[PDB]
């Protein structure tokens, strides 16, 4: 999320025991990086 | 004739006059736009 | 104690030539504290350049000053028939306000 | 309009004193800075003393404790009083804020 010029990113690695879909469980994503981009963003695309 | 190169060289000898001497020039330009500040000064603390 | 070193002591030039007066100070002069005076023979001191960059009021645009620190330089881009006079520079960056010895513009 | 007329110069014996006159026209001496400028024959200019309009005054080290500059607002005149004169004090004194020059022989 990018608000007030700051590009908030929250992240979480986690071990899983599954091969199909999103598991039943709870955890959070603490902040990792804040970037003072100050640039509007309206699109994106992932990189494999 | 009437076609002159707009570019010419400095002649720097150590014998040239003090006003005719090389001077390394550093221009420090600052901007403070709506983006957040990113480059600050390392204030030093006291004990606890 | 600031002694202004003017060079050369004499300068002979023809009209239309560019005349440069050099003015060096024994100590670096802060904020270009250099004033230029041209003294016609039998005439009182006449200010030419103030602050080494600001010309006096009504002085011709042919007069020009240059330099910083321990260098002050007065330029007359196009010599004039009445420009053959003694030019003395004065440095007022210290309480003992001192002037240069004067450079004579010859023919 | 603007003119600064010098007076009080002349030939003086050694160790004597002198009082300069500098009549200003069109100017407010008490409201603008004033200084006296001497020039020995064949030399450059030498700033001796200056007087701030509010009243502050200063003198060059060569004239320190020997010179005294003051102004008569009652006449709007600039004065430069020198004492304990000598041979080296011979110079052309013109008063500026320039004036016409006043040769001092001693």
From Swiss-Prot, chain B:
Record annotation: effect of changing residue 34 to P: Increased resistance to human covalescent sera neutralization
Recorded consequence of changing residue 1 to V: In strain: Omicron/BA.4, Omicron/BA.5, Omicron/BQ.1.1
Result for mutant: residue 8 to Y: Reduced host ACE2-binding affinity in vitro
Reported effect, residue 1 to P: In strain: Omicron/XBB.1.5, Omicron/EG.5.1
Region entry Disordered, spans: 34-48
Assembly information from the UniProt record: Binds to host ACE2. RBD also interacts with the N-linked glycan on 'Asn-90' of ACE2. Cleavage of S generates a polybasic C-terminal sequence on S1 that binds to host Neuropilin-1 (NRP1) and Neuropilin-2 (NRP2) receptors. Interacts with host integrin alpha-5/beta-1 (ITGA5:ITGB1) and with ACE2 in complex with integrin alpha-5/beta-1 (ITGA5:ITGB1). May interact via cytoplasmic c-terminus with M protein. May interact (via N-terminus) with host bilirubin and biliverdin, thereby preventing antibody binding to the SARS-CoV-2 spike NTD via an allosteric mechanism.
Annotated function: Attaches the virion to the cell membrane by interacting with host receptor, initiating the infection. The major receptor is host ACE2. When S2/S2' has been cleaved, binding to the receptor triggers direct fusion at the cell membrane. When S2/S2' has not been cleaved, binding to the receptor results in internalization of the virus by endocytosis using host TFRC and GRM2 and leading to fusion of the virion membrane with the host endosomal membrane. Alternatively, may use NRP1/NRP2 and integrin as entry receptors.
Protein name per UniProt: Spike protein S1
Species, as recorded: Severe acute respiratory syndrome coronavirus 2
């Amino acid at each position: 999320k990018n608000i007030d010029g700051y590009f908030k990113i929250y992240s979480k690695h986690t071990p899983i025991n599954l091969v199909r879909d999103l598991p039943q469980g709870f955890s959070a994503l603490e902040p990792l990086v804040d970037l003072p981009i100050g640039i509007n963003i309206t699109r994106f695309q992932t990189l494999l | 004739f009437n076609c002159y190169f707009p570019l010419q060289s400095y002649g720097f000898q150590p014998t040239n006059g003090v006003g005719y001497q090389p001077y390394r020039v550093v221009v420090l330009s600052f901007e403070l736009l709506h983006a957040p500040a990113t480059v600050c000064g390392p204030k030093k603390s006291t004990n606890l | 104690e600031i002694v202004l070193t003017q060079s050369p002591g004499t300068v002979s030039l023809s009209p239309g030539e560019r005349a440069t007066l050099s003015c060096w100070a024994s100590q670096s002069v802060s904020a270009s504290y250099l004033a230029w005076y041209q003294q016609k023979p039998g005439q009182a001191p006449r200010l030419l350049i103030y602050g080494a960059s600001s010309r006096a009021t009504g002085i011709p645009d042919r007069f020009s000053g240059s330099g910083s620190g321990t260098d002050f330089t007065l330029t007359i881009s196009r010599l004039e028939p009445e420009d053959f006079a003694v030019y003395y520079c004065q440095q007022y960056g210290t309480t003992p306000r001192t002037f240069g010895g004067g450079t004579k513009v010859e023919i | 309009q603007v003119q600064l007329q010098q007076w009080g110069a002349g030939l003086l014996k050694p160790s004597e004193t002198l009082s300069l006159s500098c009549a200003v026209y069109g100017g407010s001496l008490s409201g603008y800075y004033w200084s006296w400028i001497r020039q020995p024959p064949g030399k450059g200019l030498e700033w001796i003393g200056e007087i701030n309009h509010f009243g502050s005054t200063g003198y060059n080290p060569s004239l320190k404790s020997r010179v005294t500059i003051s102004v008569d607002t009652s006449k709007s005149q600039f004065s430069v009083k020198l004492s304990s004169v000598t041979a080296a004090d011979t110079a052309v004194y013109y008063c500026a804020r320039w004036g016409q020059g006043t040769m001092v022989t001693v």
